[PDB]
Design a protein around this ligand. Structure first.
Ligand SMILES: OCc1cnc(N2CCOCC2)s1
Length: 330
C-alpha cells in the first residue's frame, strides 16, 4: 500500500503545516501537524476542557463506530517550545492520503496548553519519530508509520514541504518526479528516539564551504533552523544591521535587508536554503525589525533541522531495519 496527502502552511510565514487525517467511522477529518520530532498522535476532542477549545475541529469518539477506549491508558507530553497536552486514549481507524491503519492509538486531549488553544488551525499532532518516544502509559503505543510499515510497498515516508505553498507527505514510495538530481542518503542514530543525523558542514551565501560535523534532528514540527552559536553568528554577520535580542528571543534584522542563502552538507551533497526562506517577518505588526529563520541551538541541547531547512529539500525518512535519511534538491 501507499499514501499521498497534501500538507498546507497554516499562515503566510509557513509557521507550521497541516495535513488532513480521517479518523473513525464515519470519517472525522482533522487537520494535524505531522511532526517527525515526536511520537504521539493526539487530537482535540469532545473530552477537551471546553475553555481550551477555540475553533479547532474535534474528534468525538462516541460518534465513531470503530472507536474503543484503551482502558487505563493515559498520555502526557511536553514539547521543546514549552507547550503541552494530556488525556486518555482510544483506538480507531486512521487514514492519511488513502493509507489506512486499523487499531491506531488516538490520544484524546483532556487538557492542552494555551499555545494550542490559541492556534485554531491545528487540530492535533501526528508524530513520526520513533515509537520509543510515545508517551502512552502504562502500555506505550506505536506511531501511525510504525503501524503502517509492514503494509507499505517500501518502509519509507517522504516530506516535501513547500515555501509559501502546499507540499506533500507520501507513505510507502519515493516519487522520482518530485526532486532534481539524486538523493543522498546519510546515517541515522535512533538512540534519542529522533531522526538524528550528522551534516557535513555549511556555507553562508557565496562563501566557502566549511567542513564540520553538525549533529542534529530532522524535525518537521519545528519551524526554524537551530544550529551551534558559532555557525549562527557566521550567518548573521553577513546581514547589515543584524542583532541578537534577548528581549525578542534571538537574531533579528532590518526588514530592508536582502538575506544571503545558507547551504548545509549532506555527505558530499549540498542543500541550498534561499535567503528568502530565512525571513520570518516583522517581530510585531508594523515593525521594521524582522525575526530570523536561523537561530542558535545553544539553549536547546540539540541542533534542529526544522522546516526552514527541510522545505529546501525532498526528504526521505527510510524506516528500514537500519533507518537512514535521504536529501535531494528540488
Ligand atoms: O490519492 C490518495 C488520496 C488522497 N486523499 C484521499 N482521500 C480518500 C477519501 O477521503 C478523503 C481523502 S485518497
Amino acid at each position: 500500500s501507499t499514501g499521498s496527502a497534501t500538507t498546507t502552511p497554516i499562515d503566510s510565514l509557513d509557521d507550521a503545516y497541516i495535513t488532513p487525517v480521517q479518523i473513525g467511522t464515519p470519517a472525522q477529518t482533522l487537520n494535524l501537524d505531522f511532526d517527525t520530532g515526536s511520537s504521539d498522535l493526539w487530537v482535540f476532542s469532545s473530552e477537551t476542557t471546553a475553555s481550551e477549545v477555540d475553533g479547532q475541529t474535534i474528534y468525538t469518539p462516541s460518534k465513531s463506530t470503530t472507536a474503543k477506549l484503551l482502558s487505563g491508558a493515559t498520555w502526557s507530553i511536553s514539547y521543546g517550545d514549552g507547550s503541552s497536552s494530556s488525556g486518555d486514549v482510544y483506538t480507531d481507524t486512521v487514514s492519511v492520503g488513502g493509507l489506512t491503519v486499523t487499531g491506531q492509538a488516538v490520544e484524546s486531549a483532556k487538557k492542552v496548553s494555551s499555545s494550542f488553544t490559541e492556534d485554531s488551525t491545528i487540530d492535533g499532532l501526528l508524530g513520526l519519530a520513533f515509537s520509543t518516544l510515545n508517551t502512552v502509559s502504562p502500555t506505550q503505543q506505536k506511531t501511525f508509520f510504525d503501524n503502517a510499515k509492514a503494509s507499505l510497498d517500501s518502509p519509507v515516508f517522504t516530506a516535501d514541504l513547500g515555501y509559501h505553498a502546499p507540499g506533500t507527505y507520501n507513505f510507502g514510495f519515493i516519487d522520482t518526479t518530485a526532486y532534481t538530481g539524486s538523493i543522498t542518503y546519510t546515517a541515522v542514530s535512533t538512540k534519542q528516539g529522533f531522526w538524528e543525523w550528522t551534516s557535513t558542514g555549511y556555507a553562508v551565501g557565496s562563501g566557502t564551504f566549511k567542513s564540520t560535523s553538525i549533529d542534529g534532528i530532522a524535525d518537521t514540527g519545528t519551524t526554524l533552523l537551530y544550529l551551534p552559536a558559532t555557525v549562527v553568528s557566521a550567518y548573521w554577520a553577513q546581514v547589515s544591521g543584524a542583532k541578537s535580542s534577548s528581549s525578542v528571543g534571538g537574531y533579528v534584522f532590518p526588514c530592508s535587508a536582502t538575506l544571503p542563502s545558507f547551504t548545509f552538507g549532506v555527505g558530499s551533497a549540498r542543500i541550498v536554503i534561499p535567503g528568502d526562506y530565512i525571513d520570518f517577518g516583522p517581530i510585531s505588526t508594523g515593525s521594521s525589525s524582522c525575526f530570523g529563520g536561523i537561530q542558535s541551538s545553544a539553549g536547546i541541547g540539540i541542533n534542529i533541522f526544522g522546516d526552514v531547512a527541510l522545505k529546501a529539500a525532498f526528504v526521505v525518512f527510510n524506516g528500514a531495519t537500519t533507518p537512514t535519511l535521504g536529501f535531494a534538491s528540488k
